Write a protein that binds this ligand. Structure first.
Ligand SMILES: OC[C@@]1(O)OC[C@H](O)[C@@H]1O
Ligand SMILES: OC[C@@]1(O)OC[C@H](O)[C@@H]1O
Ligand SMILES: OC[C@@]1(O)OC[C@H](O)[C@@H]1O
Ligand SMILES: OC[C@@]1(O)OC[C@H](O)[C@@H]1O
Lengths: 388, 388, 388, 388
């Protein structure tokens, strides 16, 4: 009867989300800066379980070692005061002008070494605060023109960078894993590892692949027109969904970062159905921006709506899967047969089975309808609460 | 002075390309059927090196074992008469109604076993004709609605199918490799393994990954808005570019299959630059459709233009790379530094190098321009033959 | 409690929708042909109010004047037997090979005159059957390459064609209006008048603009990434929404023609909200294709779902607009002020009003939040039936 | 032999283009601010004919009437010193936070009146500096959510605003025309009047339509996947191409504003062919951003490349149109017949012409190939300078 989140639902938010001041490529900030302590207190009141940060969200760029310890202490006290956790952290390798051609794959070698040292410094801080996952979004790794970047050499440099970070955490004995966040474009014309598939493929060429997974974001795969629940299914199949970023996006255009549930609502439904069915147990993290039309009351309304929409879709997807009429429709569409092996009898038995070829009635099999439209209308009725 | 192809340039064409009759989702065929023998003779006259086929392009669906041997004999004689080769073949698992929900990942198990037997039958034929690469385009593997396909079970079935094909070729002792061709959508609403990245990631979960690579197509990655030369660089980096399909596409829309060089011309330039620099030695295969506005004279003009445009872009990309002014611009943009290791001194030396962090002048590094616009204008002048 | 359509809800379907046999650019038909009489009877049973047709759906291309009258008589009897109406008709100027470069803007002049005579013949038939609206979808008017079509001359030819059709209906005294249906691409690489805006602009250059409006289709504007409710608002503002085609589309890709409510569900909600608020009184027509995975039971399930989803969204949008909490939120976001004139006092009073510039406090106005996220979450809760 | 621009080629640049400091939604400025006087001097040296400005590029927001006259005087002296002209100006109604929900269609009425007074103030300045065209880009007119903006009321407000500006210029006796610049999205989720077609249609509902035309931008129509030369042909057909913005864009994604010739090169070729054939006589204006990777040497290289690429494509398009082989191909594809009226004999003669229907041989007409692929390959060879 109530869709109230509790810290048990594992909802987490980046400091940079509710703290986004509203600067966009065509306009100035519409909101004042939020102190991270205040964000932690407000998020805790709304039912969130934790927060995440980039190094530069928490410690302003340039800070002295003492200003640093000052910023971390106040933050740690807010966490102690509220019971909030820090499950993930990441590095900002995109805002400062030095990173204009990238951090790990910048053409200048000195910038690449600086990017690695800035990252390692924040991994130590993240472990101290108890984060389990370290995200890497290579927002400036890419190009606007074809001759500017030899991509084979850049992938060599990207591999070199992640291999060194894995050597570092293993040498330190840290129990933290890495999660690469793909994005196809923006702010570079084309970004390297642009989709979940490219990131999963890259990981298999790292020296210690078991330390790396993906942190897919709803809106980013949708900027390439792709089906986000399908890509998450492939990540889960691979054993590599270490974290996830939830938000909304209306199609192929600039990265909108709308609140979760906005954008493609049916994709949100099928995503929640998959995460809850698959038993995904990581944080439900929102990487969203409250629109710059909003004042601070609207920021908190937008953040609350992220959690509300997850909990309504969870309820609808659970009602869908529990409906006996839906279970019968699933059998009518042969989802049960999809889960059976094609040829557990083995290759030789397949080759010798005349019912598989010589005496297969293809015209009868072809005439069988798949009954998918009835099934999808049951899913629609459940999403809209119209059953029925 | 002449851009004349020769069989030494390794240009190949599918039978289904020049033989496309012009049927589209809104209209009837505009051209009569071409006998494959006639296509081989005409392509050989134009300078092509070989042809490829789906089983059903060569042997009409349903054929008796004797009609079959008849079709193959006439084909083989045309190949002997012209010196044409058959470097690749593939299976049609998409046209017949029985495949309406897929071949390898159809929900019905009997259809999946039939799809495997139809494939194995054509692998034997392909080896007999000397093909080295067997392509698989899973055009019907996918869905229009979210409940119709559990994607983890479908990937299990896809893996099962490719693992069985690998067992078959290894048991037979055949020296043929497989190449998976991705496509993001069309004819299904979403197709499984939608991009080169998803296909490369999937391959690493097969039992014998070394037998499988990718067959990327220009237009398919562009249907997801992605940079095709970048994806080919990732395929080459992985050692998995076993074959390639060349054509043109104007952006994100239905699969156009225009002749190579049409569509995104600068991407075609950077693709040729990469393939020729990387020493790609496989066939240059065109998967294109002469527009249905054309008669048979226009079909052959369109096919010739595919080869012509490759050879002009090859010449322009070679002139670009050989230009001393371009080599100096490449150094000015630090492409030479991109190819150097970031930290061949190792992790501990990086950690101890104060020039990498404590005493790194970030403001000086940030002020350095990358000079990429001058470089790209040199590439433009070379493409347009305007140097200059 | 029930979402049962009745003929009073004005739902209409094209013969070609439920009768689509399932042929797509990569596969053969999966369903047998439906006799139009049978479609009329089945649709009437499901609660539809009427059907629409292209000339060639009803009378096979080539028919003799006697076979023609035979086909029309049986059709008319089915309409009499069921109470079904025919509110719209249209011409097929896209399937036959003669139309491969267009009907009204074909480069060959003889084909353009033939296209006009084929159209005029069907306008007479449409009036006889009582249609009020004649739709024109110029699916083959366009090009795959830049030199093939001079677009200024083609627009002259398009204007010439519609001007002649208007002269014909006015001379005959027919009370029928024309509705142009835009589409951005497919089957041509680019189609002329690709969006609702281009079609409305073109109409204003016709000799008798009052006889012409638009027939926008959900999926077509979404193939250009555009907001369909916004474009319909512009069509309504102009007084030109003469008819509408309802269906679903998942983003920028081939024309899917899914059932209404599939695709972008929130856009469907805002569309129904607008049509019902604006008092649109024309037919609610579905231009959709039941997926080729389906047998005939699935065709009728898909058609019923079109009507069901309209009626559920109508109920949710009406509950949204009637909710006092939503009416207060609308005032909080100043929708009431949007409807007031900016300067009904006139230009001189605006120029003399120092509160509009010299003494306007821009910092105070800037700080006012628009409260749009709270409003949108109320709209989401109403759509999901989660209030709340 | 040289592609040197001269002020006679009418190339113009906005102050905000070469002066863009490099701030993007994910990063800080990489370049220092340019004094507009310095931009005018540098552009004049490169061969430009003039500059354009938004009010806030020239006079910083908030300026006192005296600081204002100071900024304008220095600017005017730079123009006198260099011979540079100011053919266009525009208003910034998008950067300041007060415009976060729009200027002319903001929900708050006080902001709409302020937007009008800010605009009128700059129209006076523009006339003083001799501009002939006043551009309006409604970058903040739009919405991220469906309930935030009733689009019919917003179009009423947009019409009200432009009608008042037309009353103002006519009352003042100014000889200046307005040009509306469409864009489909960014920075709002959807922007009103998103394409050239929507803008042309809107203009026909203004009180004095002859004072308004369009200022289309290459990259903006390409953000909707549309064919930019086609839309410009429709604008020219309507008599409404008052100005144009040239730049490059790689497909459907964020607004890149690359230099002209980058992005879709063949579209750039067909655009130049059309503008030069049609005798477009307005400024060739570049709205581009030098990438933030560049230092000031790269800014000027990028600006020069805009002009260079126009002049090379002009030469190639002129060589194409002058080639006798191309003129014969144009006749072979019946472009000459496209330009002839379909039915100058009139409606009754068409109806009575049995060669148009009863005795039209449709099978013979259908078999005629259009020869478009040969023509397009001639256009490709001319673009690449490969003739041939
Ligand atoms: O940096 C990690 C991330 O998820 O946080 C915001 C940034 O844009 C990226 O999407
Ligand atoms: O089947 C292999 C392939 O490359 O050939 C044509 C088909 O559409 C696919 O693109
Ligand atoms: O011809 C009118 C129309 O609405 O019916 C189907 C066709 O594709 C078009 O969309
Ligand atoms: O404001 C007019 C314009 O052309 O200049 C830049 C702005 O983004 C817009 O594109």
């Amino acid at each position: 009867m109530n869709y109230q989140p509790t810290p048990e639902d594992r909802f987490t938010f980046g400091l940079w989300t509710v703290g986004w001041q509203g600067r966009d490529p065509f306009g100035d900030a519409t909101r004042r800066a939020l102190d991270p302590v205040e964000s932690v207190r407000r998020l805790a009141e709304l039912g969130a379980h934790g927060v995440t940060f980039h190094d530069d969200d928490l410690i302003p760029f340039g800070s002295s070692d003492s200003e640093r310890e000052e910023h971390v202490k106040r933050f740690r006290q807010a966490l102690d005061d509220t019971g909030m956790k820090v499950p993930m952290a990441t590095t900002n390798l995109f805002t400062h002008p030095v990173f204009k051609d990238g951090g790990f794959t910048a053409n200048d070698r000195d910038v690449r070494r600086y990017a690695l040292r800035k990252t390692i410094r924040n991994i130590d801080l993240a472990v101290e605060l108890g984060a389990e996952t370290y995200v890497a979004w290579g927002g400036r790794e890419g190009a606007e023109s074809g001759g500017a970047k030899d991509v084979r050499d850049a992938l060599d440099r990207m591999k070199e960078a992640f291999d060194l970070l894995g050597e570092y955490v293993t040498s330190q004995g840290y129990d933290i894993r890495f999660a690469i966040e793909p994005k196809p474009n923006e702010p570079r014309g084309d970004i390297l590892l642009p989709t979940v598939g490219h990131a999963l493929a890259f990981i298999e060429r790292l020296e210690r692949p078991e330390l790396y997974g993906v942190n897919p974001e709803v809106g980013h795969e949708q900027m390439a027109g792709l089906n986000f629940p399908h890509g998450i299914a492939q990540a889960l199949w691979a054993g590599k969904l270490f974290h996830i970023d939830l938000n909304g996006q209306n199609g192929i255009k600039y990265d909108q970062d709308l609140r979760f549930g906005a954008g493609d609502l049916r994709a949100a439904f099928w995503l929640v159905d998959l995460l809850e069915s698959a038993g995904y147990s990581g944080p439900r993290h929102f990487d969203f921006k409250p629109p710059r039309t909003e004042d601070f009351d609207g920021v908190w309304a937008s953040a609350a709506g992220c959690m509300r929409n997850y909990l309504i879709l969870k309820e609808r997807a659970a009602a869908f899967r529990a409906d006996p009429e839906v279970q019968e429709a699933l059998r009518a569409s042969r989802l049960d047969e999809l889960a059976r092996p094609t040829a557990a009898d083995g290759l030789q038995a397949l080759l010798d089975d005349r019912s598989a070829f010589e005496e297969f009635d293809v015209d009868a099999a072809a005439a069988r309808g798949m009954a998918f439209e009835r099934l999808d209308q049951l899913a629609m009725d459940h999403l809209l609460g119209a059953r029925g």
